[PDB]
Write an enzyme that holds these catalytic residues in place. Sequence first.
Site, PDB file in Angstrom:
ATOM      1  N   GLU A 258       0.756  -1.197   0.000  1.00 34.80           N
ATOM      2  CA  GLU A 258       0.000   0.000   0.000  1.00 34.80           C
ATOM      3  C   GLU A 258       0.806   1.276   0.000  1.00 34.80           C
ATOM      4  OE1 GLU A 258      -3.053  -0.103   0.111  1.00 34.80           O
ATOM      5  OE2 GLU A 258      -3.548  -1.878   1.408  1.00 34.80           O
ATOM      6  N   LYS A 274      -7.972   1.650  -6.957  1.00 36.10           N
ATOM      7  CA  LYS A 274      -8.277   0.272  -6.703  1.00 36.10           C
ATOM      8  C   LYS A 274      -8.558  -0.017  -5.206  1.00 36.10           C
ATOM      9  CE  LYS A 274      -4.760   0.666  -9.863  1.00 36.10           C
ATOM     10  NZ  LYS A 274      -4.698   2.189  -9.882  1.00 36.10           N
TER      11      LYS A 274
END
Length: 420
Positions: A258, A274
Site C-alpha cells: 500500500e 483500486k
Amino acid sequence: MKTLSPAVITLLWRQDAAEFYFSRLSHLPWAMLLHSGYADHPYSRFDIVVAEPICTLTTFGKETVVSESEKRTTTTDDPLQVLQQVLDRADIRPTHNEDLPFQGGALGLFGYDLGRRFESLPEIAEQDIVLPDMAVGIYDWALIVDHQRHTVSLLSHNDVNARRAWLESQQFSPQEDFTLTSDWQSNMTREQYGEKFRQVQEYLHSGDCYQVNLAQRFHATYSGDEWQAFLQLNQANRAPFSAFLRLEQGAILSLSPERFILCDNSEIQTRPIKDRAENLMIVDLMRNDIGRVAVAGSVKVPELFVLVSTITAQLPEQLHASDLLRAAFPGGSITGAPKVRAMEIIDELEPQRRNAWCGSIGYLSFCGNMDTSITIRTLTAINGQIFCSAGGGIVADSQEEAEYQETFDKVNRILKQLEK
Ligand SMILES: N[C@@H](Cc1c[nH]c2ccccc12)C(=O)O
C-alpha cells in the site's frame, strides 16, 4: 545551490537487478531496498537500492542522533524538521526527473511510535522492541531499477564511477539459510482479542470514535539470513511497496502493497485507485490530514458509488514533503477516526507498541519529491525474534469473530510461507 542533475551510469538490464545488486549489501547497516514486488502497475515501476549513507538520523523517543562521519549531534527537535535541515544543508537540488524518482536524499523508516513526536498521547503499551522510531539515511547516490524502461541506472551527486567500482567489488557472500525456529504465537488469545474488540465497541457505542484499527502481533524465533526470508516472501507476495531495510538494530522485511503518500512535483496523491436526507457519511481517513497541508481548493477525490488516486492535491510552495509527511503521520487508515482518539485507544488495547509496523517506509529525494508506504504486512527481525502484526478496522457494525479471523487472513500467507 547545486542544481546539477546527478551523474548517471546505466548497467545492463536484468529482470532481477534489484535483488542482484542488493544481495551483496543486505548485511550492511543502512543498506536499503525499496522493491516494487515485480508488480505490473505505474505505481510499481521502480526498485531503489541505497547503502553507505553520508549521514544518518536515528530517533529514539525524544532524541534524534544525527551522525556524519566522526561528527555526532543529538537533538530533541522535531525529527522531521531535523531531517528537513539535514536535507537542506546538503544544498543539493536537482530538477525533478520522472525516470529518477529518487535522486539521492533521505530514505528509511518512519516507525509508527514516531507519531508521538507530533501527537500527544499516553503511552501504556509496552516497549518490548528496541528499534528506532526514525532510522533514516542521507544518500548521495542510488541504484534505480526501471521496469517500464527496462533500465538499470546508477546515479550519484559525487563520483558515480567510484560508486560503481565500489558496488561492483562487493562480493556475493554465502548466507545462513533462513529458518523459523518455532511456531508462531499471537500476543493475544482469541478471548483476549474478544475483550479488546468489545472494548473498542464500547467506545464506538459511546460515541468516542468511529473506527479503530486493532491489531494482534504474531512472534516466532528464527535462525538464518533474513535476506533469505525476504526473497521468498517478495516472490510470493509481489507487493508494490515492499522493502528490505538493514538497520543497526535488526532487519525490516516489508511486503506492503500500500502506498502512504506520494508527493511528485508538488502533486500529492495517497492510495492508487483500486431534495433528500442522505443517511450515509463516507470519510476518507486521510482527507483531513491532507487537507491541513494542501493548497486550499486543491484536493480532488473521486465520485463514489454505493483521478488515479483516492486523494489528489497540491503541496504549497512553501512546504516541504517532510511537512506533508508530518501532518499525516501515522496513517489515518491504519489508526481510525478521529485519528488521535483512535491512537489512544489502540495504545490502551495493544499489549505492545507498534514500533515499525504500520509506520511508513520511503524516501525524501533531494529533488523535493517523496514516496512512502504504509508498513502493513511488515516483519521485524531482531535477535532471532521475528514479528508480524495484523489488524482490522473495527466499526460499529463489525462482528467479533469475523474480525478476529480477518486479522489472520491478512497475514496467514506470510506466516505459513515462513513455516513451510
Ligand atoms: N513502488 C514504487 C517504489 C517502491 C517500492 N517499495 C517502496 C516502499 C516505499 C516507497 C516506494 C517504494 C514505485 O514504483 O515508484
